[PDB]
Amino acid sequence: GSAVPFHGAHQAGIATPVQDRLHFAAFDVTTEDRAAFVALLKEWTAAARRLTAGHAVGEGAYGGLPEAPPDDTGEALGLKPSRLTLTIGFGPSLFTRFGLADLRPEALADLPKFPGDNLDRARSGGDLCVQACADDPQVAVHAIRNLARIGFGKVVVRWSQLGFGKTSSTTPDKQTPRNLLGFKDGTRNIAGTEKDRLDRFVWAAEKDGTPWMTGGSYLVARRIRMHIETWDRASLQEQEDVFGRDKGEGAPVGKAKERDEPFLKAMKPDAHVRLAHPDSNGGATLLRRGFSYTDGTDGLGRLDAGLFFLAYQRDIRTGFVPVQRNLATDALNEFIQHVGSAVFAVPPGVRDADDWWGSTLFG
Amino acid sequence: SAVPFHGAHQAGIATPVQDRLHFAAFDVTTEDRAAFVALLKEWTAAARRLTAGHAVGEGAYGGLPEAPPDDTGEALGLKPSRLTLTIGFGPSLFTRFGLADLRPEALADLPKFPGDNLDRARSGGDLCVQACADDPQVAVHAIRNLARIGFGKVVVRWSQLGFGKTSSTTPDKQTPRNLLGFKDGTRNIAGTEKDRLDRFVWAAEKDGTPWMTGGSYLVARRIRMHIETWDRASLQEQEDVFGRDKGEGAPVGKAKERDEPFLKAMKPDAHVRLAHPDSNGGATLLRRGFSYTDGTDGLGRLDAGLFFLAYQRDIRTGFVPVQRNLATDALNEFIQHVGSAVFAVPPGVRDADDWWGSTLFG
Ligand code: HEM
Ligand code: HEM
């Protein structure tokens, strides 16, 4: 239930070990006052420092003036930090505001349209995002609820997503979690200890073209519905052939152990792993950081479930875009549908107690 | 680690409250009584496996390559996680299989309550399965696999994910808070309270329905919270709504959470004053609910609330009087009941040969 340090060269919640739970919110900005938006960023940063240490925001959750609404809504009283991280990103639509147009990063690329997509516009996009991850869902929900509340009048929640369980790993020494298709997801990712690979594939560098984003990263989010009925009547072999790994151990086809290296020519040519692997994509590599979701039933007698896919990369054009384009013939396509999308530029870290989210962008 | 599946009573009622919930209501599609009994047996066999952390059937892998796996595999590598699976039978079930005359009188339909705004699509159901565990993926895997075993005979009508505390980092003794920020569960019925369970929770044979002896009756209410309105209320306003203070959760005028309330010190329409047994002719409930958050609604606001569950020996003498007494509750400003269902939760699976519903079906 320990704390993850909030300050750094980088924002936490990226290279950080992946926590069990997610509460992801996309916000739209409803103020045209740049000073008022800067004030909100600083208030949010102050709140995030309290939240990530397990403390109540502002003057607390009780013991103020009886006639005042409490500054903190109280539902995380008595809980631990629970490895809460709070990661902010700026969507491309933000840059149309506050005189920011010339500061939109080129690496913050709008995605192309992909075959098969049915994107819900209402649950897509956003001027900004906050990714809350924690081992306790109440802790994550408290954090989002309180940031939204602080932002009342200046931002609104466009759309949100709860992730009930992780489907990703930045810690290859630890058990790889399974997605709702029953396969381990995150075996060949990027570990938080692999500083060279993080610098190569995840962190923006000044020389890339956008100084304010040095030490930041770029995020793609995709809400991916799973066709659970269709998958569950597939044979074991068909399932394994879809991925290129066996189900129980998660080893590449033909191999004994999960972490043995793929031999891609032994996989079907439309196997997900074969198509996704960096060696199939000119070296393109991602830090995947997604979670499973369920959002009731579909009105047709079935559970509604999926995977909320999150990828961090140094440049959207060299990371998600080439990989996803290469999945055009993926065997997995028969079992999924992308139904939500958004991109964000995730700024560098909050250096110390005097810094604030977005300071390098806004000055 | 694991909670025994077998007993005089189903687990998941009196047994310790786990951190997470996946509750599903099912509608029955078969008209064939024998086919439904066969499903109850297959479900019981699966539940035995699930509650011990094992995959259903022949497993999640290693079978014949050309066969779909019996278990969908998303709980491989996880723990039993104190999973309990509790089945219940809705009033609508009894219109099937010739059962009309074995519907319990204690399984009463709820009246319309003031301020109800019930979504019929997220209300009712022929059956329910309450999956409670500390790991939400364990719960969801159970429901998903039961639904898959059932497909052809039952469908999922509605489902609800929920959460309480996270017990790895939160003391078990500690009362959880709801999303209004108040402690919720201080004055309840405990699993240790064997006599209170017999008085207020378990159906007795003498009550009129022999098949239900050792069972209980369940009321589910999906209760939306008006978070943004609540969060604009003053601290005094919030405490006045409940009759307890927010930080300690002590009754007004008292020092400690567990100090017994003086009801007359609370406002007349305070929640605790209206809900207390002394205000309801002694009517007492076993509350077993969970918070939810589904998302954002369409207007920027938080789709959050309380999935309220109450167990009782008779709906007519438990939930109905208490909820009736909340007609004037100060809390009503901040909540709305948007879903509802009732179930008759049969007695326990006695041993390895028994099956869910055996006392009803014979
Ligand atoms: C519901 C959707 C998806 C499911 C169920 C899924 C499942 C999996 C599984 C089971 C693995 C193998 C274990 C591992 O992580 O190494 C894997 C690998 C991977 N996936 Fe996905 N995936 C999905 C979507 C995507 C998307 C949208 C992308 C990128 C656009 C992606 C990129 C990758 C990458 C890069 C690998 C590692 C390949 C390698 O280097 O060995 N996945 N996926
Ligand atoms: C969102 C809806 C609700 C919230 C936020 C809420 C909150 C609470 C809180 C904070 C308490 C005090 C602590 C405790 O003893 O548990 C309480 C007590 C109680 N509530 Fe509620 N509750 C809600 C709905 C209901 C409903 C629908 C009923 C029953 C029909 C109910 C029955 C009770 C009872 C019987 C008590 C204990 C009273 C006593 O014996 O002292 N509640 N509730």
Author numbering:
A (entry chain A): 55 to 417
B (entry chain B): 56 to 417
Paper excerpt:
Dye-decolourising peroxidases (DyPs) are a distinct structural family of peroxidases possessing an α + β dimeric fold that houses a b-type heme coordinated on its proximal side by a His residue. The two A-type homologs, named DtpA and DtpAa react in their ferric heme state with H2O2 to form a two-electron oxidised derivative that is an Fe(iv)O heme carrying a porphyrin π-cation radical (Fe(iv)O[Por˙+]) – termed compound I.34–36 In the presence of a substrate, reduction of the porphyrin π-cation radical results in the formation of compound II (Fe(iv)O), with a second substrate molecule reducing compound II to the ferric state.
The triple variant, Y345F/F347Y/Y389F, now mimics the Tyr arrangement on the distal heme side and the proximal Trp environment of DtpA. Finally, disrupting the charge distribution of the Trp285/Tyr389 dyad in the triple variant, results in only two calculated routes, one to the proximal Trp and the second to the engineered distal Tyr347. By contrast to this low intensity free radical signal in the double variant, the triple variant (mimics DtpA on both distal and proximal heme) gave a strong EPR signal in the g = 2 region (compared to the double variant) with a line shape and microwave power saturation behaviour consistent with being caused by an uncoupled (not coupled to heme iron) protein radical. Spectral simulation of the radical signal was successfully achieved using TRSSA-Y.v2,35 unambiguously confirming it to be caused by a YO˙ species. Therefore, based on the near identical line shapes of the YO˙ species in the triple variant of DtpAa, and WT DtpA,35 we assign the YO˙ species in the triple variant to the engineered Tyr347 – the position homologous to 374 in DtpA. However, in the triple variant in which charge distribution over the ETA components of the dyad (Trp285/Tyr389) is disrupted by replacing the Tyr with a Phe, SigB is lowly populated and the YO˙ species (Tyr347) is almost fully populated.
